């Protein structure tokens, strides 16, 4: 959404030959343990199960 991906680009023969840049993007995962610091998964207390 930085005007580099949402800006239309015409064909190569047209005036606008700009290509869409490739930059890595990061998305946080909203979970109940990530909602607040007071909530966290006790990984040491739950070794039997797999997450």
């Amino acid at each position: 959404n930085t005007s580099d991906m949402t800006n239309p680009t015409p064909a190569q023969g047209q005036d606008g030959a700009r290509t869409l840049p490739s930059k890595n993007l990061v998305l946080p995962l909203p979970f109940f343990f990530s909602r607040d610091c007071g909530l966290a998964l006790p990984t040491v207390v739950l070794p039997y199960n797999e997450i």
């Binding site: 070794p47 039997y48 797999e50």
Partner: protein, 51 residues
């Protein structure tokens, strides 16, 4: 000679050992019952016009 706090690595415990996976608790909420009943129809044994 260099002196610094020795690095001690905690040990013991057990991770991913003897998976059980029995957390389910049975029970739910829905309708209670249905108050329906029927009789054994109606019998009819009469003729000859006995007044």
């Amino acid at each position: 000679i260099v002196l610094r706090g020795p690095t001690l690595a905690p040990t013991l415990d057990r991770t991913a050992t003897h998976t059980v996976t029995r957390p389910r608790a049975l029970g739910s909420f829905h309708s209670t019952a249905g108050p329906a009943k029927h009789a054994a129809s109606i019998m009819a044994e009469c003729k000859d016009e006995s007044r």
